[PDB]
Amino acid sequence: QTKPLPALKLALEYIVPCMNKHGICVVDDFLGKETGQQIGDEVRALHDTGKFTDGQLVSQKSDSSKDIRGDKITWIEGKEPGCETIGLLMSSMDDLIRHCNGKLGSYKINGRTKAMVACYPGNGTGYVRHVDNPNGDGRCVTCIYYLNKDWDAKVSGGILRIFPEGKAQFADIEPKFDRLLFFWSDRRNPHEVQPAYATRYAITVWYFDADERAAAKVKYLTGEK
Amino acid sequence: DLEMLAPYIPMDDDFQL
Ligand SMILES: O=C(O)CNC(=O)C(=O)O
Numbered sequence: 001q002t003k004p005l006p007a008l009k010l011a012l013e014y015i016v017p018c019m020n021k022h023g024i025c026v027v028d029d030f031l032g033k034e035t036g037q038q039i040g041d042e043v044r045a046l047h048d049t050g051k052f053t054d055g056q057l058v059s060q061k062s063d064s065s066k067d068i069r070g071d072k073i074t075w076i077e078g079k080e081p082g083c084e085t086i087g088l089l090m091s092s093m094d095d096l097i098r099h100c101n102g103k104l105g106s107y108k109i110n111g112r113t114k115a116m117v118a119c120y121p122g123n124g125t126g127y128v129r130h131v132d133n134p135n136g137d138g139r140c141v142t143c144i145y146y147l148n149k150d151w152d153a154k155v156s157g158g159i160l161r162i163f164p165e166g167k168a169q170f171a172d173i174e175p176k177f178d179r180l181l182f183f184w185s186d187r188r189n190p191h192e193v194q195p196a197y198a199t200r201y202a203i204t205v206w207y208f209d210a211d212e213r214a215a216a217k218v219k220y221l222t223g224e225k
Numbered sequence: 226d227l228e229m230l231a232p233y234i235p236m237d238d239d240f241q242l
Pocket residue numbers: 118127132144159160175191192193202204231232
């Protein structure tokens with residue numbers, strides 16, 4: 001059968017235990033060469049629309065956002081024509097999360113963001129060390145799909161370095177093709193995209209924990225002091 | 226601080242699982 005593997009098995013026998021124990025989980029060859037290629041083509045096609053926009057921060061600061069993240073991005077719901085395979089990816093990611101039942105931490109994943117198709121043009125841009133969700137915006141799981149064929153960080157950098165909270169050892173995740181990455185979006189996983197010296201494509205979706213997200217949105221609305 | 230480094234996300238267009 002085509003990729004990916006049954007989500008139930010992968011999630012319950014890998015992602016879940018892996019996530020609870022490490023908070024960082026890598027699934028290589030998630031969709032296989034055919035699909036990975038297709039989405040890598042939809043993403044480059046999307047990129048060629050020149051539509052991508054500099055990556056933005058939750059609470060913008062410092063001269064420019066480019067001081068924090070040097071990727072250009074675009075959001076995909078996954079049903080856009082020319083992004084049906086990204087939709088496929090997104091649905092696969094969703095299937096894995098769904099099959100983790102309620103065992104991803106204390107999280108009740110009931111939703112996610114659109115896919116953030118990201119691209120570090122490859123001019124040495126990266127993403128300084130950050131926490132995807134440091135304030136409790138609802139993001140509990142960060143899911144990333146890499147589209148970088150034969151990516152050699154020794155040459156093109158672009159390593160996603162994650163610093164699992166409490167440890168003095170960091171994980172170096174190569175933005176390699178067909179690689180699916182999962183890691184707690186909160187403070188447990190500060191991480192950085194090391195300077196990418198080649199075009200680095202990744203598709204990120206953040207899963208939301210019902211309660212924290214519900215409270216994220218409500219608190220977003222207000223400004224309190 | 227961290228808030229200014231975190232990857233921006235819409236607070237409005239969430240996809241329901
Ligand atoms: O693309 C990666 O490997 C990591 N990306 C991010 O951490 C981000 O966009 O906030």
